[PDB]
């Protein structure tokens, strides 16, 4: 819907209440896909019971699949999505959102509302129709220095670590929580 | 009103071979914190673009091993580029018909001599044209013309799983394929 520009906006009213959900189990394969095919590049995640634990964008596939050096139906996005899922709040302003996405390094995320249902996913673009031009640069600039934490599923607490072998692969993620065994 | 690229492009960029795997590619691009390079061939020709939405769209539907495919058959071809005398806002049509975020610049005599990214466009950019290139990038894809014939374009031909096996030019008259 044709809003024209505005300093001030609700993120409710310019988020995409049209986005997809996929399956935690899906392949780095097929979740693509279904980007490529909508012309889509954020997708929301949810488990076997329908929490949502994660959004697969672009750059997670660049930055937590490609490293890992296996083929894209021999990976479930599960171990590349940002988890937990990035949000923010349907009531947040544009201004808001653009600190908590740059804070991040992302370029988008999911909007949930009052109870907790996620019931959009905001990008760059929707933004960028309110957002001042130091805004739009600051967020750019976030995203391409910037990585997403994402944390542990076992203990919710602990920070996921690329683990690096001889030949720069990633072999698994390994939680920091001392008092936490995982690796994924 | 006016500003030519050449002012803010980044001569800084970083090449690499056209035979460089995905896998070493963004190996490149993470560390660096830069999601393009240019492509040079084994003669010092500028061959191509690697851009991430280069391998969203040409290498994972693939289904290989990032080190198992050359970046040639993956970064946009024929190189995405501008003059470096190029404005701005020639820039951003430019990018915005093609449906990049990025392009190569070349000088008179055709070599690249920097990258030009929407970040660098944004503090030059009115808000529509940056919302435009933004839109651009999501809504259309770069055409890899053929080679060949030129004016064919390499379109995927896929498998029963709905695999990329090659690019084949949709010219009837021409035969090509990669
Ligand atoms: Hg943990
Ligand atoms: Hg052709």
């Given at each position: 819907?044709?809003?024209?520009?505005?300093?001030?906006?609700?993120?409710?009213?310019?988020?995409?209440?049209?986005?997809?959900?996929?399956?935690?189990?899906?392949?780095?394969?097929?979740?693509?896909?279904?980007?490529?095919?909508?012309?889509?590049?954020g997708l929301?995640?949810?488990?076997?019971?329908?929490?949502?634990?994660?959004?697969?964008?672009?750059?997670?596939?660049?930055?937590?699949?490609?490293?890992?050096?296996?083929?894209?139906?021999?990976?479930?996005?599960?171990?590349?999505?940002?988890?937990?899922?990035?949000?923010?709040?349907?009531?947040?302003?544009?201004?808001?959102v653009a600190?908590?996405?740059?804070?991040?390094?992302?370029?988008?995320?999911?909007?949930?509302?009052?109870?907790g249902r996620?019931?959009?996913?905001?990008?760059?673009?929707?933004?960028?129709?309110?957002?001042?031009?130091?805004?739009?640069?600051?967020?750019?600039?976030?995203?391409?220095?910037?990585?997403?934490?994402?944390?542990?599923?076992?203990?919710?607490?602990?920070?996921?670590?690329?683990?690096?072998?001889?030949?720069?692969?990633?072999?698994?993620?390994?939680?920091?929580?001392?008092?936490?065994?995982?690796?994924?």
């Amino acid at each position: 819907v044709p809003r024209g520009g505005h300093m001030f906006m609700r993120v409710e009213k310019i988020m995409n209440s049209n986005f997809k959900t996929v399956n935690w189990n899906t392949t780095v394969f097929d979740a693509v896909k279904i980007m490529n095919e909508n012309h889509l590049y954020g997708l929301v995640v949810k488990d076997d019971n329908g929490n949502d634990v994660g959004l697969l964008s672009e750059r997670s596939i660049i930055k937590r699949f490609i490293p890992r050096n296996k083929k894209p139906d021999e990976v479930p996005i599960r171990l590349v999505m940002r988890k937990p899922i990035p949000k923010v709040k349907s009531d947040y302003d544009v201004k808001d959102v653009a600190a908590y996405l740059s804070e991040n390094g992302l370029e988008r995320c999911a909007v949930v509302d009052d109870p907790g249902r996620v019931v959009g996913i905001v990008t760059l673009t929707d933004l960028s129709r309110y957002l001042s031009r130091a805004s739009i640069t600051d967020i750019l600039l976030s995203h391409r220095t910037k990585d997403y934490q994402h944390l542990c599923p076992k203990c919710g607490v602990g920070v996921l670590e690329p683990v690096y072998n001889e030949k720069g692969e990633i072999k698994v993620f390994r939680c920091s929580n001392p008092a936490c065994d995982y690796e994924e």
